[PDB]
Amino acid sequence: SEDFVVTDRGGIVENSHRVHAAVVDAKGRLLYALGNPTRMTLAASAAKPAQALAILETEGVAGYGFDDADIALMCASHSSEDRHIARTRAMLSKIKAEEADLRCGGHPSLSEMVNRSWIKQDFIPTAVCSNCSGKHVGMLAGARAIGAGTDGYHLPDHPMQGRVKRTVAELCDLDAGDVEWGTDGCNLPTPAFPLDRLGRIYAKLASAADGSDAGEGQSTRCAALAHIFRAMARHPEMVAGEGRYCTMLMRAFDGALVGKLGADASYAIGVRASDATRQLGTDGALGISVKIEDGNLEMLYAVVTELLERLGIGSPDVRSQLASFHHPQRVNTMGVTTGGVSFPFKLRG
Amino acid sequence: SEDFVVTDRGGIVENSHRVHAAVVDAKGRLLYALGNPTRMTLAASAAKPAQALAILETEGVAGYGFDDADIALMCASHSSEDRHIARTRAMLSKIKAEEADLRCGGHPSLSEMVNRSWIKQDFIPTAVCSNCSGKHVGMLAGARAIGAGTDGYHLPDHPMQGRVKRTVAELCDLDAGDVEWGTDGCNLPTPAFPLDRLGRIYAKLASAADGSDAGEGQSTRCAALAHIFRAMARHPEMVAGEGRYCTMLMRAFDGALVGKLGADASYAIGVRASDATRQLGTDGALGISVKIEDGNLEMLYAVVTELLERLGIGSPDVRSQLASFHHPQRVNTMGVTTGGVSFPFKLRG
Ligand SMILES: [Cl-]
Ligand SMILES: [Zn+2]
Ligand SMILES: [Zn+2]
């Protein structure tokens, strides 16, 4: 419960970061942990698969013809690359809406290279550039589909947000009062719930993919979760973008898991049943959720990759694709190596 | 002690950050604390007044004619504004050296607005653009002055770095073995020592300023320390830059204190004797040092400003110049305030 990632300069402690993590089976049962695995935690973008489920379950959304890449964008914190903006526009045309209907705002790109090119051309980002633009088009779609009208689709009193709030609690297996709600950077309601339940959501996504693959009679909701998993794993460049952790992670694993960033350094992974998960002592899929207490994103990616290695998820060759995140470079302005990152935590079973 | 600064979204905890702080008198005696006031801490740029002392105490350096603004740049983590680069080049001319003699490297500017101009211009920062460039020119100056040789002025075996190492330990009142050393981003040795001793350095700076102002006989060391304080207080724009915390802080206080940032969220302040310092229980100058365990810079400035309020240093009107740092904006992409910062820590005496 005193679990840290620690950075050093020449062996001298620089910063230390408290780690919380939960590893759960398909029913949410805790298998491993770091820190406080039930920490009440703001899920932010890590909750988007649950918001995508509310959208996909809305009567009439099926008629718009969203494809797997559209759903991946719904699930995205994308880098605002030109292909992300283009897909946002295509999805707006599917529901006969326009950029002015979006109630999210522009922000500097989550990708440094994209942001640099915007600065170079004095580009001012707008609503269609939001990292959450696919989720917002999906919410516009649901509001239009049930004839609720698009103005106010983002407000808590709107039936689309009523559907979101109910769906999040159901996937977490919590009562409505056990989920807290604030306002997100994209101006939508955003939930907070115990960290282990974020893992439970992703364990259910991977379990639904396994059940779909195995030809099981799934409920419609399990079918839709299977679809969300498949969409994310098939189009991981839409979920984030070039150079991004989530994209590189999901590409490396080639369908064996999905992974998603949450704001202020949280992360969730849904792992399909495998030799690794069976070795970990469960007979189904697995869920992983992580939170760095102070919010440092660089440390998040380092810790998640170390956790994948300790859990034996993937092969050493597969995870070596993430080496630049696992041990972030610590070189000074003259090319001299001056420091490092250590993982003194111990996963408890 | 469980001393934190905490951010929230709608009252839901987002991130928390552990706080360490030391408030010391002129002899180093601990008056108040947060967290662990003796935490072994890399001083990084907060050590620069001690490095400047070692420069100014190198025999012959007086002959180059560095003025107070030059000395303020030796003490700086500047924003690489054009005036900082220009002064660096002027200082190299004073010592008949060239940019190729520097052993620090360029880096993206510490100022977002400067770095935005650089991006629009495709400007590549070079050695004279380093936030440490003034310190490096001073070290070259001292190497030249004693006849050592400029090659290797930055290496631990060089007499300039031997002088730095001895000077840091003396100011801290530590044996050599109680100061650890690593290599800095600017490619110089950088010390680590207990956090309270950083406060001690700055108490001694402010105490020397008081002794000079009162006309007391001073040792060559105290006279040099008083000069460093005066240079920083008179030229705070050289120590950091427009819009930077250290510059706004020192301008607001108009000579009553000096302050300096260290990388990975450390800060140090030397306070001249005043009603505030007497009210705090000491009869001379005071030093303050702070470290955010996880290295978040926004949180550091919020904590330092909150600490000055709690210590009664300044007036509500002097401190209000720092209001944007004290309570950082938490506004989303649509202009809605979504949260805030809180200070659940308790000063202890
Ligand atoms: Cl470095
Ligand atoms: Zn969002
Ligand atoms: Zn430096």
Residue numbers in the entry:
A (entry chain B), B (entry chain A): 4 to 352
Extract from the study:
The ReAV enzyme from Rhizobium etli, a representative of Class 3 L-asparaginases, is sequentially and structurally different from other known L-asparaginases. Asparaginases (EC 3.5.1.1) catalyze the hydrolysis of L-asparagine, generating L-aspartate and ammonia. ReAV is a homodimeric protein, with each subunit containing a highly specific zinc-binding site created by two cysteines, a lysine, and a water molecule. Two Ser-Lys tandems (Ser48-Lys51, Ser80-Lys263) are located in the close proximity of the metal binding site, with Ser48 hypothesized to be the catalytic nucleophile.
The positively charged Arg47 side chain participates in salt-bridge interactions with the carboxylate side chains of Asp187, Asp267, and Glu17 from the adjacent protein chain, creating a network of H-bonds that supports the dimer structure. Furthermore, the crystal structure of the ReAV protein in complex with L-Asn showed that the guanidinium group of Arg47 stabilizes the position of the substrate α-carboxylate group. Thus, replacing the protonated Arg47 side chain with alanine disrupted the hydrogen bond network in this region, rendering the mutant protein inactive. The crystal structure of this mutant revealed that the absence of Arg47 caused only minor structural rearrangements and atomic shifts in the active site region, which were nearly identical in the four protein chains. The substitution of Arg47 by alanine affects the conformation of Glu17, which can no longer form H-bonds to the Nη atom of Arg47 of the complementary subunit. The metal binding site is conserved in the mutant structure and fully occupied with Zn2+. High difference electron density peaks were detected in the close vicinity of the Ser48 hydroxyl, as previously observed in both the ReAIV and ReAV crystal structures, and these peaks were interpreted as three water molecules forming very short H-bonds with the Ser48 Oγ atom (O…O 2.30–2.50 Å), as well as within their triangle (2.40–2.50 Å). The hydrogen bond network at the Ser-Lys tandems (Ser48-Lys51 and Ser80-Lys263) closely resembles that of the WT protein. Only one conformer of Asp187 is observed in the electron density maps, with one of its Oδ atoms forming an H-bond to the water molecule from the metal coordination sphere. The R47A mutant was inactive as well, due to its inability to anchor the L-Asn substrate in the active site.
